[PDB]
Amino acid sequence: IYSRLLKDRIIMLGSQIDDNVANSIVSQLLFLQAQDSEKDIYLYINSPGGSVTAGFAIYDTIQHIKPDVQTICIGMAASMGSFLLAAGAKGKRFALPNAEVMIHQPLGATEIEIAANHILKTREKLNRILSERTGQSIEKIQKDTDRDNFLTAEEAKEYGLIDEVMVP
Amino acid sequence: IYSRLLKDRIIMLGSQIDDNVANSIVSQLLFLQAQDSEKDIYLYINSPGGSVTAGFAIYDTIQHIKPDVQTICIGMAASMGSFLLAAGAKGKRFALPNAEVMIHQPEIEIAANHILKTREKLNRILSERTGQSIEKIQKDTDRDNFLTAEEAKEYGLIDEVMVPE
Amino acid sequence: IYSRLLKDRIIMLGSQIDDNVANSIVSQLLFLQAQDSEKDIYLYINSPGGSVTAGFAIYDTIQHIKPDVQTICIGMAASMGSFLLAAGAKGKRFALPNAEVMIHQPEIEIAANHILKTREKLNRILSERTGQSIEKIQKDTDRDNFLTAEEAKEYGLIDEVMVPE
Amino acid sequence: IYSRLLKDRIIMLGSQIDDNVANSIVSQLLFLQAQDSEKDIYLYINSPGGSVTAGFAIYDTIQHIKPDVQTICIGMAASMGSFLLAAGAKGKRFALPNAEVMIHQPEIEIAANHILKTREKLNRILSERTGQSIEKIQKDTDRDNFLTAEEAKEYGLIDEVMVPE
Amino acid sequence: IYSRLLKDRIIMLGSQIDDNVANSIVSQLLFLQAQDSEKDIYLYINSPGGSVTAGFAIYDTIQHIKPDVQTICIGMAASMGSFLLAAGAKGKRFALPNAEVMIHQPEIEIAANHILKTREKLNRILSERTGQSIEKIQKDTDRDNFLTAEEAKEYGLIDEVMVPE
Amino acid sequence: IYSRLLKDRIIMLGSQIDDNVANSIVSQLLFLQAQDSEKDIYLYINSPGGSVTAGFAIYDTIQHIKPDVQTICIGMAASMGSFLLAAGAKGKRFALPNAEVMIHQPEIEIAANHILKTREKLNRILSERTGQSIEKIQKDTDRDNFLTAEEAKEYGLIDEVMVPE
Amino acid sequence: IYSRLLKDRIIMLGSQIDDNVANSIVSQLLFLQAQDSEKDIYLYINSPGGSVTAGFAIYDTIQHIKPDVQTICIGMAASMGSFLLAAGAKGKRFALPNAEVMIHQPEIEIAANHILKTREKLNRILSERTGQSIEKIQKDTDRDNFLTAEEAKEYGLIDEVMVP
Amino acid sequence: IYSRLLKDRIIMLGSQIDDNVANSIVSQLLFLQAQDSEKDIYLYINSPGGSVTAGFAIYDTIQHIKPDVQTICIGMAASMGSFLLAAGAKGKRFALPNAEVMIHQPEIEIAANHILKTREKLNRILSERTGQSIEKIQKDTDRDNFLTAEEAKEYGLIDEVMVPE
Amino acid sequence: IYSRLLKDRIIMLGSQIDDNVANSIVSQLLFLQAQDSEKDIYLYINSPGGSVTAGFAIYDTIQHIKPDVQTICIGMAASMGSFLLAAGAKGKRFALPNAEVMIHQPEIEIAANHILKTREKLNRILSERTGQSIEKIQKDTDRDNFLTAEEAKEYGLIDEVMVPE
Amino acid sequence: IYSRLLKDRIIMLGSQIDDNVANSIVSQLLFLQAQDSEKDIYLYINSPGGSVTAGFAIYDTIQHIKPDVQTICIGMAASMGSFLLAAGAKGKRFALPNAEVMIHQPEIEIAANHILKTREKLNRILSERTGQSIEKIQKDTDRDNFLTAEEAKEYGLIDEVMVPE
Amino acid sequence: IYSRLLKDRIIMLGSQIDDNVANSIVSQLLFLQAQDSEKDIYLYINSPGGSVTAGFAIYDTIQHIKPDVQTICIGMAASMGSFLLAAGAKGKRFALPNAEVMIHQPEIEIAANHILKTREKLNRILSERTGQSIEKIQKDTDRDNFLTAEEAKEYGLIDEVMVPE
Amino acid sequence: IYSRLLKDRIIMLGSQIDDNVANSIVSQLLFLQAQDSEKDIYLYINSPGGSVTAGFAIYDTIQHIKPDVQTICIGMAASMGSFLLAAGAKGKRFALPNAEVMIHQPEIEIAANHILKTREKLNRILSERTGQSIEKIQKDTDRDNFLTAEEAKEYGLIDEVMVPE
């Protein structure tokens, strides 16, 4: 059922992000480029978020591929999911009227897990990448990513997450 | 089994709405759009209701897709369930004669707003599609009350109670 | 295993009726309509009975679908179970010789009404399909009594007790 | 594992009879009818016995299906277990040499009748299929007695004790 | 895990024999018959022993199936365990060198007979398959004695003690 | 979790040996034979020791299977535990450097023999596989003594103490 | 729950060490070897300490497996607990800043030897991996003393106290 | 704790009536008789009700002892609970104002009689002590109905509803 | 609590009879003999019944002591319970009006005798004290039947049903 | 532990009210009456609330005993919990400053009455002891609302909020 | 309670014999010697039997004390229980009519001797006091057999079966 | 009970020796010295043995008191139990004929010494009082061996095995 969608180059990120899900989408991202490098990819996102490392793997492949990947936020986008929303092609990042976006990044388990992310400083990268595309200063990013809050669709547009709010 | 129904453009919504179901619904809607963007989509509803955020993802995608989506309530539809019933394409939102419809509710500086602000966004979107005045909707979604099929018609949730044939 | 029966248009109702089963029934009915909207549907029933709201969803969908649905009781059918037996397509509602049939029951300003109002809606819909007068039905669904296959025929639940062949 | 036996039209009845098992039996019988309505069905029986109502649902469906059903007792068969043994298609009801067979029993104005009336309906249906006179059956199902394979043959439960080959 | 052994026609009997195990054995035997009715069945035995009636159901089904069943004792086999060992297909009943074999026992007008009559039926069926005279078997099953693999061969329980290779 | 090791032909023996474990070991051995009858089987051992009869069933099956079984002691191995260590395929029986090995013991006309006769059968089978003379083994299994890995090599239990790499 | 950590090659050692735990550890180590014999294994340690013999089975298997095993102490590690900490793959043996480390002890012709001989085998194997001289180790494992993370580094138990 | 009440001739009946409680009651009654055979015994009752046979043992011993026994209902008293309330010494049987009282029910040739015959013996013994006519009692103990303290007085269960002071 | 009754020469028998109770009874009987060897002993009985051997120890000691022992049944007395009731000192064996009385039952060369021989010794000792003929007793202790107080008097178990006073 | 408090005439009510607790409360009240019928009883209350019938048994016994009972709320008191708070001896019913108080709710011909009739009996008995008019009480017990200590004083539940000292 | 019997020189042996009981017996024997070294000691016995070593301590002390000790069996006496019965002072060892008597049994170089040597010391000491020849005793203590009171007299365990008076 | 024996200067040592018992012994010894410092003290011993340190406190106090202390073994005396037997006043240390006697055993720089040094102090103090040479005692206390009364006499533990009289 995803396949017939895959044939139209529509990819769905629908759940918590783990390596299994990441691997699947990366496989789908490559598969679409092999089908055509020119045509757009529709990436629909409803996720709470998930593992940070698996996020980059999805992020990098979206960056590495030639095709334009649009992101469209449906439902709730949070953690890595929200991160992949702002990571879409510029001008192509949309959200439906009612979606809620939370850019908070949870710290998480064993510290060693922390050992790499802090070592990873993904937040810095996460803050760095998010700051560049959203246009906000790194400091402001650092603060919000540390806080629990929920932006509406519109509030995510002014803040720089989504370029548009799609009307019915 | 569901595919054979899906091939005929019927979508069953059968249980409390979580991220798993909502996703599975959304994917089917975008599917049935990719199949044929003209013929309408029959969406049955029997639910106790479900998580709010997972509800909108079904709501918005109903609006965002081109085809008409006929919500047909059967049996209980409550909480975010009915809110999908009332979200159907106008004129096509049905119920079966014996079914019942019902409506109700599911750092603190921020959390207290998010719980309130989330509810008005339900109170509004029902005020359009029922046509009732918010001062009534504001009151109804608060208190639990059981609307029979007919009393829902008068209320503005369902347009036509489907009579057997 | 069930599919192979489903392919032959037989639907087993095997246990107390919850949202899980009722859904699985409904989906199969709308299925067997999508397959062929002419040939009748054999619906077996063996149940202790189940939740009310989940029962209607099976009831209404029997009415709402085009084909005829032959309810065949085997073994005990009680509470909302029999109420589906008596809901079959007229003339086709059967029982096997040794089976038994039985019928009975499952803020306070609102709750007291909803419990009463829900029951009349059972008392009515049995009054049509048994043909008995509500003053009798009003009394029967209250007290527990065990109707053999034959005594059900006389009573109006089942039309034809199926004799072995 | 059972399917591979089911594909060869063998049905194991392995434990005390509840609604879960009885259903699973019934579904398999109606299945093996849908597969082939000619070839007979081998039904093995090893049981301590089970709930009465769940027994009939196996009994009636044996009668209601077209094919012949060969009940083969192995090991103990007692209470509602044997009553299925004696319910097999005449001439085919077997036992293995060493197996044992046994027979026995499991508002008050109504309850006292239902407990009595349910038992005669066992006393009758054994009187046909054993051929014994009810005045004997009336007595046997009351007292616990252990019938060896042979003594069952003389008694009329099993037609042919299967000798090893 | 067991299936992969079952696919190779090996059946482990691992614990005291109840209705649950005996059933699971029987179903596997009738299975391995349905697979291939020619190739023999390896049946390992390690048991303290089990319920009598559940034992026969394994015994009779060994006799009733067509293929040869090679009982291979490993470790202790006692009470109804050995009685299955001695029930293997003649010439194929084995033991491993260090294993041990042992044999022994588990209204009153009726109960006193059933306890006696059940035991002779063990005393007989061992008298055939060991070849010993009942006056000896009558005595052995009474008293507890530990037969090594070899002493079992001399005794007639096992034909060939399997030597390692 | 164990399966993934089992797939690589490793078998953990982790606790005192009862019928439950011994069975689970045996089934795995006959399994790994059915998979591949060539490649050797790694059998780790960490045990305080266990029931005698349940030990042999592991012993005999090691002998009875075709593949080589490498017993690798880690941590304490005592009583019937070591007796499996010393039962490995010759030349492959290992230990890790720091592990310890130890050996010792667990109508009256009959019982006094069975307790003695069971022990010689341990004294013998260690006399082969250690190579020591029974007059020494007869003495060692009586008194409790703690053999380090090396002192076991000199003793004949383990062939090669595995050094880290 | 642990599997999901196990899939990422982390092994929690959470309580006093008995045969049940030690076995469960060993099986996981041989597992993570069967999965991938290259990538190192993170082994966390929080323990009051446990039975001696069950400790070695964890020790030896750390040595016997190919991959590197990084022992990370968190919270108290004492008795046979620390002895696993000090048994990690050299250079990778860590501690968190606030954790504490500690070391100490648990026919008569034979029994008196086995209790002594078992302890030297602890005194030796710590003398290699701490680098301290046995005459010091011989003394330390006798008396109870609480080594903070840093004082353990100086002592030779842990190589690098992990800073947040 | 209870003894100090027992010393003052108060007996609490606190839970469903089993053999354990009934015994403990009986022993206390015969006790309080042995202490003083003149002064009356206060017997409180709060019960959902209990086993029939264990009830009589409390009933009969109330009759068999010399002193007067004042049954004081507090909270629910139902099934065999009330039947003790109505069994108090005439004129002294009380209730507190808000308490509720209720009455209802708990080989086949013999069993069907014993279940009927046991109930009449309740229907009779209530007919004396309530004074109502059996044709009414015969009907009341069948159907579940909730008698408030006062409505019990009118009914004849309790003589004097105790008003607070 | 019991002592105060014991001081008044009352002995409660309250539960199924095990070695613990029987001992506690015996010790009390020999006690009440040591106190006063003249005044009779009141022995109440409410029991489901108990182990046979532990029953005799109460029986024999009733016979062996000098004083008269008045067995007073209250509530159910069955199995070895009634057998103590019928064992009271002749003329003093009572029952209360509503109580019920009932009677029934609880190497193989030896075991089959011991189970039979133990029962006749009950059949005999009831034949004396009821006065009934063994051919009747032989039949009664086999089948379960519920004797009311009066029907026991006619039967010979109890001499005088105690009427309330 | 509680006894030492009980000796000082303090009674803790600590959890949701079932038959077990209510009984344990009642027994303690009748106890503290038997100790001294003059000195008042301190009754603390911290509860989420409990079963209705088990509540009255605490209510009535407060009224029925002679001494004054000072209800002291601490922490949440809700449902039948507060209804005991408001049931204290007038003038002594307290609360601590930070505690919260709250009030709300827990054949069909009969059942619908019993659920209604049971609630008025709560609505009444609060109308006396709060002094509020039933038309207000009728409304308050329906909707959930959180009354702080003070707002309860104004409301009439508690007389004096106890200030720390 | 026991003291009052002890004051009359009766000693109850009521349960399986452990160190706790045996001690309590011994202390009582040496006591009753210190009281009066002339009058005989009544020792009742009802036991399933107990630990061997704890038995002798009762045996030897019977011999070592001056007074005569009359063992009176009541109910079952088995294993080390009877061995005390047969250890009474000659001529005084009794039984009650219905009681039953029975006799049977409870490093390896040493352990095998200690288990044998301990038993002969029972076989001997019964050979004196029964008078039977060891070749018979050697056989009897091995096999379980139930000796009635009389058959014990003939056997030499008890001198006089006490008849009721 | 013990006092009455204590008054006659008998002291029972009945169980494994802990601080509680040892204290209770010591206090009694110093007592019986305070009573009369001339007459000897009978000390019975039946023990499995006990804690070492608690043993000496009994040993030393035997030596430290003036009177002679006659240790009389009855039944098993082992571990620190016998070591008290052998500690009696020379010439008076007895045993009863059937009793058995046995002897055996119960920072590391310090702990290894304390366990060794504590044992020699047992090996010595037995070497005096048995008279055996330490090279024998050194060996005996190591291995478990069961000394009958006589074999103890030859060994030097007991002087005179007391024969019955």
From Swiss-Prot, chain G:
The protein's superkingdom reads Bacteria
State the UniProt keywords alphabetically. Cytoplasm, Hydrolase, Protease, Serine protease
Q: Which InterPro entries match?
A: ClpP (IPR001907), ClpP/crotonase-like_dom_sf (IPR029045), ClpP/TepA (IPR023562), ClpP_His_AS (IPR033135), ClpP_Ser_AS (IPR018215)
Task: List the Gene3D superfamilies hit by this protein, alphabetically.
Answer: 2-enoyl-CoA Hydratase, Chain A, domain 1
Give the main location: cytoplasm
Q: Which reaction does it catalyse?
A: Hydrolysis of proteins to small peptides in the presence of ATP and magnesium. alpha-casein is the usual test substrate. In the absence of ATP, only oligopeptides shorter than five residues are hydrolyzed (such as succinyl-Leu-Tyr-|-NHMec, and Leu-Tyr-Leu-|-Tyr-Trp, in which cleavage of the -Tyr-|-Leu- and -Tyr-|-Trp bonds also occurs)
What is annotated as the active site?
A: 79 (nucleophile), 104
Q: Per UniProt, what is one Pfam family of this protein? A: CLP_protease
Subcellular localization, as worded in the UniProt entry: Cytoplasm
The entry describes its oligomerization and partners as: Fourteen ClpP subunits assemble into 2 heptameric rings which stack back to back to give a disk-like structure with a central cavity, resembling the structure of eukaryotic proteasomes.
Protein name according to UniProt: ATP-dependent Clp protease proteolytic subunit
Originating species: Staphylococcus aureus (strain Newman)
Q: Taxonomic classification, please?
A: Bacteria, Bacillati, Bacillota, Bacilli, Bacillales
